[PDB]
Design a protein around this ligand. Structure first.
Ligand SMILES: COc1ccc(C[C@H](NC(=O)[C@H](C)NC(=O)CN2CCOCC2)C(=O)N[C@@H](CC2CCCCC2)C(=O)[C@H](C)CO)cc1
Ligand SMILES: [Mg+2]
Lengths: 244, 231, 250, 233, 240, 212, 222, 235
């Protein structure tokens, strides 16, 4: 019968790893680097686009950074289309929680459910895993500012600063070197851009090859604001830290 | 060889190897014999034991008052198939008030086994059956094989070394076919037939199993002291 | 009987590639060239109607398809795969949008739905990816004019102008030289016609070229009058005659 | 849940020494409208069984198709289909009874009363009744509808217990049946003059008579009956 | 539905998918459980090629299943969440129908049954997880420690360890744990638990987690210093 | 029916009549209305005869499975809750049951639960249940003290059912008595009202409404 | 509206002796004011020395008996030809009846035979499977006529020892098969006198360790 | 690979045969039937001395009159025991009687070939099912993952089985007392066990008509071990 053509996407190797998870991670390692840095007064998300053409429509574009709700955003490394499937799920999950409890969903709870969905594809159903790693940036009134990552294994962890995609090894070393606990958002912005600047596989880091977002306490008293940067705003903030 | 992975695959010469392998479990089975006159039909089966401390595995199953069978091969498969027959005999009774013709019992078994030789994932039954009964057209003996082939005979045998008993019955045909009105003489001929298939060993009291059905006799099974009469 | 293929036929190889997606893209490479260009007041999508025999009537085979009155699609790769995607894309515009909001979806959202369908053929059990890339051009009230490319993976990107298939490397280079943010629709049609001559072997006239625009509303194409707010489809297929008129002044 | 539309009235029957007789008229009523006039309500099955049906005619026609499909099915892979493995009357009955009780148990009955008459293979007479509730019973005489009320008392004067059956001939029994049919024509407002009659004998087999008529009717005394009490002219 | 028999027998009578699930356990961070006279302690290594971790929010390695029972594990982290959730649901369901919280044995038997089911159902692979489950039965003061593994077998342990280098630390506990005399206090029991982890771990920095469970739903996690005090003090007893 | 059970100093008394009715037809005078689930568990029956028998013997099977799986006898609380959760599933379908689950465990002490087919479950010291409950209550309540001797408690239980058997047209036959202690249940006999009424009238000097 | 139930009349009666039991029933079958049959048996030998009657709505009665007979057959198939004891039959029948709790078999069922000590046994059921073992039971249409007579003549209810000042009861004692058959025949002729649905024939099945015997008596046919 | 329900060319089911290998690797279990009772004994085989041996449960009650011991992949047995217990209690509910030992065993064995592509593989555990019923008296059955079961006067399963069985062949006679059988099980267990048999690493149980199925405490088994060495010394 059909057994002949089944790759068996959910089995252990003799070493006890999950082939498809490992191979999905290998795929992700060639995607545009994305960085998240957490400050005491906000969070930065910065990410590098995949080798652009001059004709790409840069301002109506989105590939790396998506809004999950008003208090939570993600940066994507991996297959964009796989990521959109998970993002819509996550958006719906958030609204169900708000509908049930009349309260915005705590960041971890949203992160956990998405990670559980990923986990399921590694244990049953014989389908390939999602080729995606996320950096979650969000705020809630229990833990304040939070950063997490998840990858195709459905494993998630919390961070002060983290990268995913290409060159995370170099990026993690640079972040470790210059990160400090008492840091502010505007310092974190600079750290994120300088780190991408040094790990990038292109000759120089320009506005048109980036996506950028902040999550600040940055409006009127106690309430949180998400800013997905327009191209001109990235151009300015690139000059303002002297990379161009 | 490359063509024996499942029942859904023909070999290049048109063979079905998984069915042929099921047939092979029958050949390793302990021997059993069937034969009939015009008034009775008899089963004789040599039961096998695990060792000296064990029971001698039953090989004869009653299906209805007028029908039953003996098995050679995988016993759980005989239990599944006999249970189906019990149900079919029973449905004929409840719905039509009619005792199931031994011939229909045969067609129903052929069709049940056939399904498992044409679809993926299932396997063929690994057991052969000899079915006796007395119905509205007299005494009958049937041979079932898990290929689905069912055959009506005056007498036969299946299992290891069943070839001896089958030759004997082939010679004896004209004798036993007219042992009418005599239970114990049809049995003795059956017990004789089965003896042509013994080696290193002979029929004891916890080793021999006999059943009879006929004109004025419900399908009944004899084991233990009640077969001593026959050794 | 029944589908026992409930496992994925696209999976990760040890190097991390998804073989079936790569191979689908290879089928797209062999496909006939198609392109799209975004002007300030319109979008043009074009391709070559490469006919299979001259006994075939190639007007009965439309490579450029209306999806909504303001959205059109063209492709490169496997024609049959494209045809069923158009059927599904048209339907999803209704089921997942118009039947809910009483209006046609904006371009990026319809593109989003098509992309979803193509992504699922990359992960669901017992299917292969679609062997096509799409270029979808459209207009909607709050985004204006837009042009998108959708690939076998389900990934999509917005373009100022681009090309796909056979001679796409050369055609993307040509368009880089000629595109600016001031192009008026007529200029973009002319550039489209020039770019497409590069990749076409044989006859190059209005019977071998298929070209449509997303431009001004066409009240004459509506089919009725008396609702002031219904002004007509912005999608218009150029006729054989209209294409030849533009080929002499080329 | 159902209501009978086009209906047939009584079916009457009795055992005699060598067989069974069964009769039913040829009418299909539509309420009080005597709508259809050539309706056969005795259905033979092989050469040894007649099934007589009253009640809803659409359901009767369904039961015909069941029976004729039963014959077909019984012939399949059956070399003794016209001999030792032919359908017995008792087989046909148990099948119909099974169906009737299942349909009542699903609250969707076949709105009928049925009598199965025939001779078994051992020569024994068979006569059993089943209806829309799946109630079954046997008796030397059996009738449905008005037949139960007016025929049974007449037919019981001939065969009143089991031991009267050997003493009853086919001429006596048929006469009693034919008389009962006349009485029902006098007294049942949904009966017709025309009827069919069938005899199933262990020696002569199945005889099936069509287009019988109620004859020898007394109507003459009607001329003397005037008014409703005091009127003389 | 996807149906494949993924866990099947090989000619030698092994189920390779179950055995490879054990390899995943062996690769997981080490975990140990030691029971005292009047408590149980659960210790867990956390690997340290990860600095820039946020420790407030990363899932801790010991999970409360109910207020009186805890579960730790070695192996696939994502796999463990599924077992913990199921165990948590079962604990509330038990309280609802029996009107009594689960025994530690009962909860262990349930989790073990889940693990076993995944070794003979079509379309699924086994859990790449072994667990230690510890606590006190309702209204009881006798400490309880059980282990489960991917096959579904479970059993009670005076002390036990799982994960990478658990053979080294089982060695340690086997010569240092006296059946006849269990660590008669919290202090003693925590110490022995930290001693066994130091055989394998590195610096006792942000590398050792400890959770203490006492009777009547008394469960507390130590923080760095409280642990660090054990680290410092044992190292000073060592120069001898 | 009339059934009762009460807690006291000496454990639990359980008493029931033995009449079955089909409207005004007396269907039986000798019917058992207590089920001995295990040596420490009794269940009383009132309502639909089949409903009570069927589901209470089913309850016994579930209790037996508990002790096989958990190697420990089921609690009165848990056993009563198996039955109440069962009947709650059937709520609206027209089951008719009024039951008391009476027993002793070490973790609970002597315990009574009232369970009915509405899904009501109540722990308590005293209940009477059935068409005669009010009659039994009137006698039981007006002589109950926590400190009754085993001998007096048994009598009160017997006397209460007798009261109900006399006044309630749908109660009668005979009294069946049980005493439940830390060592389990003990049967205390069948007492036909045919004789018991007259004996109690003579010895107690009560029932002066009756022609002597 | 369709009514799935009818009422076929008749009445049944079971008495247990020390080493035997009888189960009797009239043989009349009716609907409304009509007689369907004067001889339609409703007491059956079910095998393993058990007799059974399910009296009320005959279609339900026949279905139940068929299901129980079939149950006996499968009990043999499944439990190595073991004999189904009367107590086990009764419990099995409870489950057959209670399975249709919300769409009942409209019958009063009685079974008779011998218990596992060889003593006579009568078990009786309500329509949804409530049951009890007794010495004594009547069921069906005339049950309300016959039952109190049985209380008096089989269990000596309301009968005292003469001269004892109503202080000593007539002592319980088993009855001979001859005395039992007298009570059965008188029960049924009495019932035939006053109940229109009872008449025509009486058929008694007697059960002992040697098996099942039948006796038949004529009843008034009006 | 190849389907889970495939026959070998010798006409045996690959998966069943392979599960039989897994059982051979299992700890030893022995049962002996007498006219006074049936004894069941097992080797606990703790994998490490820290594991608390009383938590090893390889002998199990099914009903008052039926007991069971296991050998092989013992976690596979939980659902077979659960099915066994339900079938026994259910039979008592439907028929107001004890279920026959053979009937129970047949029911457990009905689960066995319910695997394919229903569970994904055969069970990797064998069972000794021991009990009493009024019709056939004391009985011992060996239930295999082939769905076959066999009645035995005595039987060993697990790693030491081919040795133990030859020993039981010699020692079993139709008149053994319960005490003789207890000692015999203890004796044959000490022979085939790796470690030195004591009351902590082996366990006994019996089922008698009169008291049903009982697992022996460690004090009680210790004495039977003491009594066994004294018997062996004294000749
Ligand atoms: C839901 O409708 C009901 C509810 C309660 C009763 C009283 C009950 N009697 C019966 O159950 C009688 C024997 N049988 C029936 O009424 C027949 N079925 C009733 C259910 O619907 C189908 C027909 C009866 O006698 N109850 C006794 C307690 C029983 C006695 C038998 C053992 C179990 C406990 C008791 O409550 C007093 C007498 C009041 O009934 C009747 C119908
Ligand atoms: Mg009368």
């Amino acid at each position: 019968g059909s057994r002949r053509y089944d790759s068996r996407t959910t089995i252990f190797s003799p070493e006890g790893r999950l082939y498809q998870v490992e191979y999905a991670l290998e795929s992700i390692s060639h995607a545009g680097t994305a960085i998240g840095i957490m400050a005491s007064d906000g969070i930065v998300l910065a990410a590098e686009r995949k080798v652009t053409s001059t004709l790409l429509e840069q301002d109506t574009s989105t590939e790396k950074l998506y809004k999950l709700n008003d208090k939570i955003a993600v940066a994507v490394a991996g297959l964009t289309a796989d990521a959109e499937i998970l993002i819509n799920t996550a958006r719906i999950h958030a609204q169900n929680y708000l509908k049930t409890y009349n309260e915005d969903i705590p960041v971890e709870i949203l992160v956990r459910r998405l990670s559980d969905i990923k986990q399921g594809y590694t244990q049953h159903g014989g389908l390939r895993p999602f080729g995606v790693s996320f950096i979650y940036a969000g705020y809630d009134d229990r833990y304040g500012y939070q950063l997490y990552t998840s990858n195709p294994s459905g494993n998630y962890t919390g961070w002060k600063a983290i990268s995913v995609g290409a060159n995370t090894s170099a990026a993690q070393t640079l972040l470790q070197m210059d990160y400090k606990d008492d840091m502010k958002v505007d310092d974190a912005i600079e750290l994120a851009l300088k780190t991408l600047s040094k790990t990038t596989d292109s000759s120089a880091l320009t506005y048109d090859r980036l996506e950028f977002a902040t999550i600040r306490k940055g409006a009127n008293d106690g309430e949180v604001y998400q800013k997905i940067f327009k191209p001109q705003e990235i151009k300015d903030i690139l000059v303002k830290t002297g990379i161009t | 060889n490359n063509y024996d992975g499942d029942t859904v695959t023909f070999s290049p010469t048109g063979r079905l190897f998984q069915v042929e392998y099921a047939l092979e479990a029958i050949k390793q089975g302990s021997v059993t014999v069937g034969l009939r006159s015009n008034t009775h039909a008899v089963l004789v089966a040599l039961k096998r034991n695990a060792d000296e401390l064990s029971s001698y595995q039953k090989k004869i199953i009653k299906c209805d008052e007028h029908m039953g069978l003996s098995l050679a091969g995988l016993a759980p498969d005989a239990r599944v198939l006999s249970n189906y027959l019990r149900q079919q005999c029973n449905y004929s009774s409840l719905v039509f008030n009619r005792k199931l013709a031994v011939e229909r019992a045969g067609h129903l078994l052929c069709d049940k086994a056939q399904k498992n030789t044409q679809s993926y994932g299932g396997r063929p039954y690994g057991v052969g059956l000899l079915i006796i009964g007395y119905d509205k057209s007299g005494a009958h003996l049937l041979e079932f094989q898990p290929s689905g082939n069912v055959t009506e005979l005056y007498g036969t045998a299946i299992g290891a070394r069943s070839q001896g008993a089958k030759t004997y019955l082939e010679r004896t045909l004209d004798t036993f076919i007219k042992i009418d009105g005599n239970p114990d003489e049809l049995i003795k001929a059956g017990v004789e037939a089965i003896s042509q298939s013994l080696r290193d060993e002979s029929l004891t009291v916890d080793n021999l199993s006999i059943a009879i059905v006929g004109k004025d006799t419900p399908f009944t099974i004899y084991d233990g002291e009640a077969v001593a009469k026959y050794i | 009987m029944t589908d026992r293929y409930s496992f994925s036929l696209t999976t990760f190889s040890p190097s991390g590639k998804l073989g079936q997606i790569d191979y689908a893209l290879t089928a797209v490479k062999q496909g006939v060239t198609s392109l799209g260009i975004k002007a300030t007041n319109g979008v043009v999508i074009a391709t070559e109607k490469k006919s299979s025999s001259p006994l075939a009537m190639s007007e009965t085979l439309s490579k450029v398809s209306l999806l909504t009155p303001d959205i059109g699609a063209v492709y490169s790769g496997m024609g049959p795969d494209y045809r069923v995607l158009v059927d599904k894309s048209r339907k999803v515009a209704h089921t997942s949008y118009k039947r809910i909001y009483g209006e046609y979806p904006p371009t990026k959202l319809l593109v989003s739905e098509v992309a979803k369908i193509m992504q699922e053929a990359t992960q669901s059990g017992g299917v292969r990816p679609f062997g096509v890339s799409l270029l979808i051009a459209g207009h909607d009230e709050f985004n204006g004019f837009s042009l998108y490319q959708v690939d076998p993976s389900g990934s999509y990107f917005p373009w100022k102008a681009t090309a796909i298939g056979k001679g796409s490397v050369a055609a993307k280079t040509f368009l880089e030289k000629r595109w600016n943010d001031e192009l008026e629709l007529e200029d973009a049609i002319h550039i489209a016609l020039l770019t497409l001559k590069e990749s076409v072997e044989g006859e190059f006239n209005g019977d071998t070229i298929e070209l449509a625009i997303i431009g001004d509303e066409n009240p004459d194409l509506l089919g009725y009058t008396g609702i002031p707010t219904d002004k007509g489809p912005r999608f218009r297929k150029l006729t054989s005659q209209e294409i030849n008129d533009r080929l002499e002044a080329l | 849940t159902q209501q009978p539309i086009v209906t047939g009235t009584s079916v009457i029957s009795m055992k005699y020494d060598n067989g069974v007789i069964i009769a039913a008229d040829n009418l299909g009523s539509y309420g009080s409208l005597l709508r259809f006039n050539g309706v056969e309500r005795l259905i033979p099955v092989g050469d040894n069984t007649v099934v007589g049906i009253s009640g809803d005619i659409s359901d009767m026609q369904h039961i015909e198709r069941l029976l004729k499909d039963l014959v077909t099915e019984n012939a399949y892979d059956n070399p003794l289909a016209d001999a030792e493995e032919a359908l017995e009357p008792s087989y046909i009955f148990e099948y119909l009874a099974t169906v009737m009780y299942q349909r009542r148990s699903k609250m969707n009955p076949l709105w009928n009363a049925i009598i199965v008459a025939g001779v078994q293979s051992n020569g024994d007479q068979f006569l059993r009744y089943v209806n829309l509730l799946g109630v079954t019973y046997s008796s030397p005489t059996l009738a449905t509808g008005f037949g139960a009320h007016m025929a049974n008392p007449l037919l019981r004067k001939v065969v009143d217990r089991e031991s009267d059956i050997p003493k009853t001939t086919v001429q006596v029994a048929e006469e009693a049946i034919v008389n009962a049919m006349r009485v029902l024509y006098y007294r049942d407002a949904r009966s017709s003059r025309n009827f069919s009659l069938a005899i199933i004998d262990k020696n002569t087999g199945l005889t099936f008579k069509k287009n019988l008529q109620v004859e020898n009717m007394k109507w003459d005394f009607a001329k003397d009956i005037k008014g409703y009490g005091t009127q003389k002219i | 539905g996807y149906d494949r028999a993924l866990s099947i027998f090989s000619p030698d009578g092994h189920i390779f998918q179950v055995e490879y699930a054990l390899e995943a356990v062996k690769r997981g961070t080490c975990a140990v459980g030691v029971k005292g006279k009047n408590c149980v302690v659960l210790g867990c290594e956390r690997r340290s090629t990860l600095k820039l971790q946020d420790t407030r929010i990363t899932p801790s390695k010991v999970s409360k299943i109910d207020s009186h029972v805890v579960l730790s594990f070695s192996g696939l982290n994502a796999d463990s969440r599924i077992l913990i959730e199921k165990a948590r649901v079962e604990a509330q369901s038990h309280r609802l129908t029996l009107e009594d919280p689960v025994t530690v044995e009962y909860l262990t038997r349930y989790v073990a049954g889940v693990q076993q089911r995944y070794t003979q159902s079509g379309g699924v692979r086994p859990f790449g997880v072994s667990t230690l489950i510890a606590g006190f039965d309702p209204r009881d003061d006798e400490p309880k420690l059980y282990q489960t593994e991917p096959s579904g077998i479970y059993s009670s342990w005076s002390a036990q360890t799982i994960g990478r280098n658990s053979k080294t630390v089982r060695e340690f506990l086997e010569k240092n744990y006296d059946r006849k005399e269990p660590p008669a206090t919290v202090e003693e029991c925590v110490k022995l638990t930290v001693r066994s982890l130091l055989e394998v771990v590195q610096t006792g920095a942000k590398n050792i987690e400890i959770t203490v469970v006492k009777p009547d739903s008394d469960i507390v996690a130590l923080s760095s210093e409280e642990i660090n005090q054990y680290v410092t003090q044992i190292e000073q007893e060592k120069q001898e | 029916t009339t059934t009762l059970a009460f807690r006291f100093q000496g454990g639990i008394i359980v008493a029931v009549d033995s009449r079955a009715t089909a409207g005004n037809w007396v269907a039986s005078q000798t019917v058992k209305k207590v089920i001995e689930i295990n040596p420490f568990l009794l269940g009383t029956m009132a309502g639909g005869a089949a409903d009570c028998q069927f589901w209470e013997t089913w309850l016994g099977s579930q209790c037996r499975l508990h002790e096989l799986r958990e190697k420990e006898r089921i609690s009165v609380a848990a056993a009563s809750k198996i039955l109440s959760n069962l009947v709650y599933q059937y709520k609206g379908a027209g089951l008719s049951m009024g039951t008391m689950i009476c027993g002793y465990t070490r973790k609970e002490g002597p315990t009574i639960y009232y369970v009915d087919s509405d899904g009501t479950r109540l722990k308590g010291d005293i209940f009477c249940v059935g068409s005669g409950q009010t009659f039994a209550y009137g006698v039981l309540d007006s002589n109950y003290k926590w400190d009754l001797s085993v001998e007096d408690a048994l009598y009160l239980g017997k006397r209460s059912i007798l009261a109900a058997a006399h006044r309630d047209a749908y109660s009668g036959g005979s009294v069946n008595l049980y005493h439940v202690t830390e060592d389990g249940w003990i049967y205390h006999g069948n007492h036909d009202v045919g004789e018991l009424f007259w004996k109690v009238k003579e010895e107690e000097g009560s029932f002066n409404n009756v022609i002597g | 509206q369709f009514n799935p139930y009818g009422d076929n009349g008749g009445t049944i009666l079971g008495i247990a002796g020390e080493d035997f039991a009888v189960l009797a029933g009239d043989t009349r079958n009716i609907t409304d004011y009509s007689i369907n049959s004067r001889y339609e048996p409703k007491v059956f030998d079910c095998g393993d020395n058990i007799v059974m009657s399910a009296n009320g709505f005959a279609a339900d009665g026949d279905a139940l008996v068929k299901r129980f007979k079939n149950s006996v057959k499968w009990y043999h198939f499944d439990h190595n030809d073991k004999k189904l004891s009367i107590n086990s039959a009764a419990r099995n029948i409870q489950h057959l009846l209670y399975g249709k709790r919300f769409f009942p078999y409209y019958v009063h069922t009685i079974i008779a035979g011998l218990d596992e000590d060889g003593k006579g046994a009568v078990y009786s059921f309500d329509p949804v499977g409530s049951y009890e073992r007794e010495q004594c039971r009547a069921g069906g249409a005339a049950a309300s006529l016959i039952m109190p007579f049985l209380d008096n003549q089989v269990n000596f209810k309301n009968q005292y020892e003469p001269g004892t000042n109503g202080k000593v009861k007539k002592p319980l004692k088993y009855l001979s098969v001859e005395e039992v058959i007298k009570l059965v025949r008188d029960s049924f002729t009495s019932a035939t006198e006053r109940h229109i649905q009872v008449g025509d024939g009486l058929e008694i099945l007697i059960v002992t360790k040697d098996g099942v015997r039948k006796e038949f008596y004529e009843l008034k046919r009006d | 690979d190849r389907g889970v329900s495939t026959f070998s060319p010798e006409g045996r089911l690959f998966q069943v045969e392979y599960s039989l290998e897994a059982i051979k690797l299992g700890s030893t279990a022995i049962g002996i039937a007498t006219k006074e009772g049936v004894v069941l004994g097992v080797e606990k085989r703790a994998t490490s001395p820290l594991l608390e041996s009383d938590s090893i449960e390889k002998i199990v009650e099914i009903d008052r009159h039926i007991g069971c011991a296991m050998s092989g992949l013992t976690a596979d047995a939980r659902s077979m025991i659960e099915h066994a217990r339900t079938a026994a209690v259910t039979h008592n509910l439907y028929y107001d009687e004890d279920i026959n030992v053979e009937s129970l065993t047949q029911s457990v064995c009905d689960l066995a070939l319910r695997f394919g592509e229903l569970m994904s593989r055969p069970f990797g555990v064998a069972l000794l099912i021991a009990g009493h019923d009024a019709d056939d008296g004391y009985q011992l059955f060996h239930a295999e993952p082939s769905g076959t079961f066999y009645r035995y006067n005595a039987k060993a399963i697990g790693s030491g089985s081919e040795g133990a069985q030859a020993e039981l062949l010699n020692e079993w006679h139709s008149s053994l007392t319960l005490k003789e059988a207890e000692l015999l099980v203890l004796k044959i267990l000490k022979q085939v066990m790796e470690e030195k048999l004591d009351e902590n690493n082996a366990q006994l149980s019996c089922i008698t008509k009169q008291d049903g199925f009982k697992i022996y405490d460690n004090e009680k088994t210790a004495e039977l071990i003491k009594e066994l060495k004294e018997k062996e010394a004294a000749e």
